[PDB]
Design a protein around this nucleic acid. Structure first.
Lengths: 1359, 89
RNA sequence: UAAAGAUGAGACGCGUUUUAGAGCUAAAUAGCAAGUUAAAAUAAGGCUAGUCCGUUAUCAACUUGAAAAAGUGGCACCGAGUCGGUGCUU
């Protein structure tokens, strides 16, 4: 009947719901069209429904696999360079050598050459292995000896040194600044004394080299290192850091009062994120500590690998490995002797059986070191003579290998030493090695920097590299082909996050100077001080903040309350004892960079000239971005004359990490027109009303919100959705919602909707982690007080989840308006009282509610009570105020008895609290729909608005439900996603129609401000422009307004406007309309089909086996001979209709089957379908009869029985229980007896209500009975819950309703799962048959569900 | 967006399209289709195949090595009905 | 109360499958000797050929004839058990 409609939308985490309403709030119905091979040409449907999908993960495993592939590619290229050099002389020695190292993997029967790789003939292979046992023997024989050696063995040792090369952390050469343990130890204690100046650590008589590098165990060395120190506890902090550096697992929980334990071990694969989780709880100021333990650990283990002194050979590493080899040999011989002698029935099970964790399980099986030691420890303890071996086993130095996991700390300069010696020896016996030396050393010591990126030419979306010539980048002409200035320029303009408040700017580094002036002047501006005669504790002045920031902060690192009260007040300002109100025992902002560069420059005037800022900012950003040496050296040459040589050589080892979130142009770029000041200028001196950053953003009286708001303009759609924040499931919901909006405008004749209303719900709850902080918060209150209450009745973390009990604890057992105490077992008989009445604001947090004995203690007026608790309980309010039991704002709410009743700012704060949206994602979603709908442009280039997109506070609709009795039971069905879209759509329209002067608040647009202080009644019966007195803006839905004192008044019935007067809310028809709309059987449900993507199989490599489902892993490596993968992944399904052979007759009978197609075989299928199916053993396959079926397909059987194809061999239920409203009200009033939260009178009338209507139990058993007999089709479990329904027919309501809401998991949409009765656990029932599907209608639906297309799989199958 | 990469929307559009060409069988339009899978599994952007000139340069460069012998100009400008029908403006 | 918050660049080290490290003594089998290392692969592969790209984001069916003109599917009443019936128009 109307052509101006509205769309309602709610966005969740796994659903989006949508509804189309008209102005009389009905849902219009239409006939839609069906294509296919049916004679059903049009069906009626309603315009309301839901959408259900699945969440998507993060992009981290993809990136890890990708960079692993890059590194393997580059290592193969280095071996190709080396063979390319030796190819010509190797052709003179032996032609067929590199072909013998080509194909050394294959079985002999696929070997064309001879099978021994190096020499080829067997005598030289056996002689070669008997002479040089490992690779390191051969390397030592090259470095020491003085003969002429073969060309091949030189190639094998140089290949072994260029393939595995070492880490690149120590940059430069090996010198004792970063190689000896003692200097690193002194760096650790100077970091620690730099942090904790109060309790210094002496280390003067400490020789950490002899202690931490001895042939002893671990814990003995920790005890000795404490036993040299003057009185440290072994489980303190410093002992836990030394125990971190040795490789033991401490807990830092007792050192900072954490909540759970935390174990750290450096040798474990998840050290980085655990260290970053610990550093997110104690501040980001503890980084150099936990780094400087790790560098000390690398120095210790590197001093443990090198058990060879110098001045003998040039190769220490090889002699260390040979020494390890001979100790391994000797101890093996002794162990076989002792176990051979004393336990002769265990000699077989240790030395042959590779299924135990014996010796053969350590050599040939797969057991690690640790399982071997824990296996043969007590078996050594049962014998005699193993004292030396037990000493070694406790030293963790028994029966080792050469390729172990400790080698992650051998630096590349050691391999470069051995390589350099081998090149300097032999080159008098070959001329080409005399020519080619810097070539090979340049092959080893080359590492691509961070600012060059991948070396692409334009087939990659990950690169930014720019070239200078046109050749092939090799290691030798990298510095002649790659332009590095423009490359670094693109690196800066790519690797910096943008500003969120204002784009086209880049953010500041966290360690910069200006950002820390920002946070210090942010912390100082909100402190108060109370003095005798200063009963309102005022803020600081301008010169006061200048003196505090210039005496306390540019001299000292950290400032706490002791030097706050003492070192400035009892020095200059000359007071006696000043109350300090607003800082929590120490400040939290600081100045780190000023003390760091104050250490480095050892000078004062250059830091304080105020004309040297951008120099320092280029230095700080330069140290933040790059981690290269040569490019820092390049980017600091322009400041050479300002610094001397030692300080110039001391800046360049300093770095920082982390970014802030404010640009410079925000802080000091823009002003206010009325002020002419920057934001930091307001933070320095404002005068009267000192406000922070969050109060200067949203101040309507200034230019700031209009500059930022007008300055957010912001390419395709995936860049918009890509370039903002949020957990990515909500981005998935945003994209699906935009698709749904375009198709609802397609259906309705392309007329633009008048209103789109979007609400974003939440499923974000993690734990009651703030309730452990409620138990600990009460411990803060009573540890602050020290009274005699918790000695009578302590606290726990299970009882306090009830709000009556927590609000019982928040008065210290003392009654408020009666000078008595409170009983522990009268929680149900202690009344909840409100200070400001419910008809002004609806606040249900800790702030508003207070406990009382009886609800007639505060008098009889609606406004503030008498002033007797103020004069009686003022010290009580004082020590509640210090103890953080009542907050600052709630104590400002308890002092409302004095300041003159209620005024304009309180009620404007009631409405201002109940309108203003503050979260930062709905604003940008509204910018997406506002940027997409409104494109009509006027003549002055202003904003034409045709579409209003509106977002609402997410408690209005729940208040509507609990008030007008439209209850919500979540476990019944899925119709609540559409009902919430419907109620969003209604309530938003009524609230925008009733109040025309409330569009600047909650309609996203550049609108002007109206005076709130004049559009509020200043009296009670004042009532037109004065809209209302009672500040709750949801009152006019009611019929009788209600106070909190004892008075209840009334209102008229038909609710219209007072300026124009159009009918916006009725009382008679609308509850029957809205109550009728919630009662429909047919609501649109769409499961969103998907295609499986991911890896090819399980990522383990099985041994060789003569089965037929092991995937090959190379094209000619047969898994009967070489082994491969295990179990693939099915991507989708395909229907096939074509005749095959019957048998030896090869007869031609038709079939109709269902096929699985893996991810590895998807391109070959989509390249030629008929050829692939015709090669899979079919004949006469057609074209139009190939149907693709993804996961979650929808098949319609008889009688409305629907199924969803979950895999190739599992179906799922797909119908819906549409239950009338009366049963929903009865179950919800029946079960929720625990969380009632209501006055006992009308709730007692509700107990009479269930007591009268106690037969709906039997009616609901009839409903589930016939519905389970119609579509669900399960018998034995249904009879089982009928007998189990018979054996509990006499319990009260408050359990029977609970097990009926537990009954409704029999008839859901989704998976067939199990559930629990009172006592009987009803098992699941699964579908394992896909046979009925092939005689059903196959339904194709679009995204909304309206446009369908049916394919009849019952006729197709013959001719 | 408007770039044609190795997506899943792109692969379903090309599978819809690879059913279609079995109708037109007296021409040779198969080899151009396999070639355009060839540029697309190797990571390129084939979103410049909306102009009929660019397809002619590519089929000429591909004719330089001796491949795609049987393809005229008459088959190609037929085949460019198809990156404006399925996807393409 | 709001306000990290996702995405990207460089390099080690182990791990895992086959082959080579001449096993011996005396049908089934028993007794003995031995053991650490190395070569190749690290998703099958792709081709306007780079020291590039291959597990995240993204996805109903049909479509050769002129645009943020058009890609493909009439509108109102009386009902209500997963959607029916009627008018008019076609």
């Amino acid at each position: 009947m109307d052509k101006k409609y509205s769309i309602g939308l709610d966005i969740g985490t796994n659903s989006v719901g949508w509804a189309v309403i008209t102005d009389e709030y009905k849902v219009p119905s239409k006939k839609f069209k069906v294509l296919g091979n049916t004679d059903r040409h049009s069906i009626k449907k309603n315009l309301i429904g839901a959408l259900l999908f699945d969440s998507g993960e993060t992009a981290e495993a993809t990136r890890l696999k990708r960079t692993a592939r890059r590194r393997y590619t580059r290592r193969k290229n280095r071996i190709c360079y080396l063979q390319e050099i030796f190819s010509n002389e190797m052709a003179k020695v032996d032609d067929s050598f590199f072909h013998r190292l080509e194909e050394s993997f294959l079985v002999e029967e696929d070997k064309k050459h001879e099978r021994h790789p190096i020499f080829g003939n067997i005598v030289d292979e056996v002689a070669y292995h008997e002479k040089y046992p490992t690779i390191y023997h051969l390397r030592k024989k090259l470095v020491d000896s003085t003969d002429k050696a073969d060309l091949r063995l030189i190639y094998l040792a140089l290949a072994h040194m260029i393939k595995f090369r070492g880490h690149f952390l120590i940059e430069g050469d090996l010198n004792p600044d970063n190689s000896d343990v003692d200097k690193l130890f002194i760096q650790l204690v100077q970091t620690y004394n730099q942090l904790f100046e109060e309790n210094p650590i002496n280390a003067s008589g400490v020789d950490a080299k002899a202690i931490l590098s001895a042939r002893l165990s671990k814990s003995r060395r920790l005890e000795n290192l404490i036993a040299q120190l003057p009185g440290e506890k072994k489980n303190g902090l410093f002992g836990n850091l030394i125990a971190l550096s040795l490789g033991l697992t401490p807990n830092f929980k007792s050192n900072f009062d954490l909540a759970e334990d935390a174990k750290l071990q450096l040798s474990k694969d998840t050290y980085d994120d655990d260290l970053d989780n610990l550093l997110a709880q104690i501040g980001d100021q503890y980084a150099d500590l936990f780094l400087a333990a790790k560098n000390l650990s690398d120095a210790i283990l590197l001093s443990d690998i090198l058990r060879v002194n110098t001045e003998i050979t040039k190769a220490p590493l090889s002699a260390s490995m040979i020494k390890r080899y001979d100790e391994h040999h000797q101890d093996l011989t002794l162990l076989k002797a002792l176990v051979r002698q004393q336990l002769p029935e265990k000699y077989k099970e240790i030395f042959f059986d590779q299924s135990k964790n014996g010796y053969a399980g350590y050599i040939d099986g797969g057991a690690s070191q640790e399982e071997f030691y824990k296996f043969i420890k007590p078996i050594l303890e049962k014998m005699d003579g193993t004292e030396e071996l037990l000493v070694k086993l406790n030293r963790e130095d028994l029966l080792r290998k050469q390729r172990t996991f400790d080698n992650g700390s051998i630096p590349h300069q050691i391999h470069l030493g051995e390589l350099h010696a081998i090149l300097r020896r032999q080159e008098d016996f070959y001329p080409f090695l005399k020519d080619n030396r810097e070539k090979i050393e340049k092959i080893l010591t080359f590492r691509i920097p961070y600012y060059v990126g991948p070396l692409a030419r334009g087939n990659s979306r990950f690169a930014w590299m720019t070239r200078k010539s046109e050749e092939t980048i090799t290691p030798w002409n990298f510095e002649e082909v790659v332009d590095k200035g423009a490359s670094a320029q693109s690196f800066i303009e790519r690797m910096t996050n943008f500003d969120k408040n204002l784009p086209n700017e880049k953010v500041l580094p966290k360690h910069s100077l200006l950002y820390e002036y920002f946070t210090v002047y942010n912390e100082l501006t909100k402190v108060k001080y109370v003095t005798e005669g200063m009963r309102k504790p005022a803020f600081l002045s301008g010169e006061q903040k200048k003196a505090i920031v210039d005496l306390l902060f540019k001299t000292n690192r950290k400032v706490t309350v002791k030097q706050l009260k003492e070192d400035y007040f009892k020095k200059i300002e000359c007071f006696d004892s000043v109350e300090i109100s607003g800082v929590e025992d120490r400040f939290n902002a600081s100045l780190g960079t000023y003390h760091d560069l104050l250490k480095i420059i050892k000078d004062k005037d250059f830091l304080d000239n105020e004309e040297n800022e951008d120099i320092l900012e280029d230095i700080v950003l330069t140290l933040t971005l790059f981690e290269d040496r040569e490019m820092i050296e390049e980017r600091l040459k322009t400041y050479a004359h300002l610094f001397d040589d030692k300080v110039m050589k001391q800046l360049k080892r300093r770095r920082y990490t982390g970014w802030g979130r404010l640009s410079r142009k925000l802080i000091n770029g823009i002003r206010d027109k009325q002020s002419g000041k920057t934001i930091l200028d307001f933070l320095k001196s404002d005068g009267f009303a000192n406000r922070n950053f969050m109060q200067l953003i949203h101040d309507d009286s200034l230019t700031f919100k209009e500059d930022i708001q007008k300055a957010q303009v912001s390419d395709s759609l995936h860049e918009h959705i890509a370039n903002l924040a949020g957990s990515p499931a909500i981005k998935k919901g945003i994209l699906q919602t935009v698709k749904v909006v375009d198709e609802l405008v397609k259906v309705m004749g392309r007329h633009k909707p008048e209103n789109i209303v979007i609400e974003m719900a939440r499923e974000n709850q993690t734990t009651q982690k703030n309730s452990r902080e409620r138990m600990k918060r009460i411990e803060e209150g009573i540890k602050e007080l020290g009274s005699q209450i918790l000695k009578e009745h302590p606290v726990e973390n299970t009882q306090l989840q009830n709000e009556k009990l927590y609000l019982y604890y928040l008065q210290n057992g003392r009654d408020m308006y009666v000078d008595q105490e409170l009983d522990i077992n009268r929680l149900s008989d202690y009344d909840v009282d409100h200070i400001v009445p419910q008809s002004f604001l609806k606040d249900d947090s800790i702030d508003n509610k207070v406990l009382t004995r009886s609800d007639k203690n505060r008098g009889k007026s609606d406004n503030v009570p008498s002033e007797e608790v103020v004069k009686k309980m003022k010290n009580y309010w004082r020590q509640l105020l210090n103890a953080k039991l009542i907050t600052q704002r709630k104590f400002d709410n308890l002092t409302k008895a004095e300041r003159g009743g209620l005024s304009e700012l309180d009620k404007a704060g009631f409405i201002k609290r109940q309108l203003v949206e503050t979260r930062q994602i709905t604003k940008h979603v509204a910018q997406i729909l506002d940027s997409r709908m409104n494109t009509k442009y006027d003549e002055n280039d202003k904003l034409i608005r045709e579409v209003k997109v509106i977002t609402l506070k997410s408690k209005l609709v729940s208040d509507f439900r609990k008030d007008f009795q439209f209850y919500k039971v979540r476990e019944i069905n899925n119709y609540h996603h559409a009902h919430d879209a419907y109620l969003n759509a209604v309530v938003g329209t009524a609230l925008i129609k009733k109040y025309p002067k409330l569009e600047s608040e909650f309609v996203y647009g550049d609108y002007k401000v109206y005076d709130v202080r004049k559009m509020i009644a200043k009296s009670e019966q004042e009532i037109t422009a004065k809209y209302f007195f009672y500040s709750n803006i949801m009152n006019f839905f009611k019929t009788e307004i209600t106070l909190a004192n004892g008075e209840i008044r009334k209102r008229p019935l038909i609710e219209t406007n007072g300026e124009t007067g159009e009918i916006v809310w009725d009382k008679g028809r609308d509850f029957a309309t809205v109550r009728k709309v919630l009662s429909m059987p047919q609501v649109n449900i769409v499961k969103k089909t998907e295609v499986q993507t991911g890896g090819f199989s399980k990522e383990s490599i099985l041994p060789k086996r003569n089965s037929d489902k092991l995937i090959a892993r190379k094209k000619d490596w047969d898994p009967k001979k070489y082994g491969g993968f295990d179990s693939p992944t099915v991507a989708y399904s395909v229907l096939v209709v074509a005749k095959v052979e019957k048998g030896k007759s090869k007869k031609l009978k038709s079939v109709k089957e269902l096929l699985g197609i893996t991810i590895m075989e998807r391109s070959s299928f989509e390249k030629n379908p008929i050829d692939f199916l015709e090669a899979k053993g079919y004949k006469e396959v057609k074209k139009d009869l190939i149907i693709k079926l993804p996961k979650y397909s929808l098949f319609e059987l008889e009688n409305g029985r629907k199924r969803m194809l979950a895999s190739a061999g599992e179906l799922q239920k797909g119908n819906e229980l549409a239950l009338p409203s009366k049963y929903v009200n009865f179950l919800y009033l029946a079960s929720h007896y625990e969380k009632l939260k209501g006055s006992p009178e009308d709730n007692e009338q509700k107990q009479l209500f269930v007591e009268q209507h106690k037969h709906y139990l039997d009616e609901i058993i009839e409903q589930i009975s016939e519905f389970s007999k119609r579509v669900i089709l399960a018998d034995a479990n249904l009879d089982k819950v009928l007998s189990a329904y018979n054996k509990h027919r006499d319990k009260p309501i408050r359990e029977q309703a609970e097990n009926i809401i537990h009954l409704f998991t029999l008839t859901n949409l989704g998976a067939p799962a199990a559930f629990k009765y009172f006592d009987t656990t009803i098992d699941r029932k699964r579908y394992t048959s896909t046979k009925e599907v092939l005689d059903a209608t196959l339904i194709h639906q679009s995204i909304t569900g309206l446009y369908e297309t049916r394919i009849d799989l019952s006729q197709l199958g013959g001719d | 967006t408007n770039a044609i990469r190795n997506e899943t929307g792109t692969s379903s559009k090309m599978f819809n399209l690879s059913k279609r060409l079995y109708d037109f069988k007296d021409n040779n339009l198969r080899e151009i289709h396999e070639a355009l899978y060839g540029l697309l599994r190797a990571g390129y952007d084939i979103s410049n195949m909306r102009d009929v000139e660019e397809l002619a340069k590519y089929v000429d460069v591909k004719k330089s090595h001796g491949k795609l012998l049987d393809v005229t100009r008459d088959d190609i400008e037929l085949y460019h009905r198809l990156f404006v029908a399925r996807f393409g403006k």
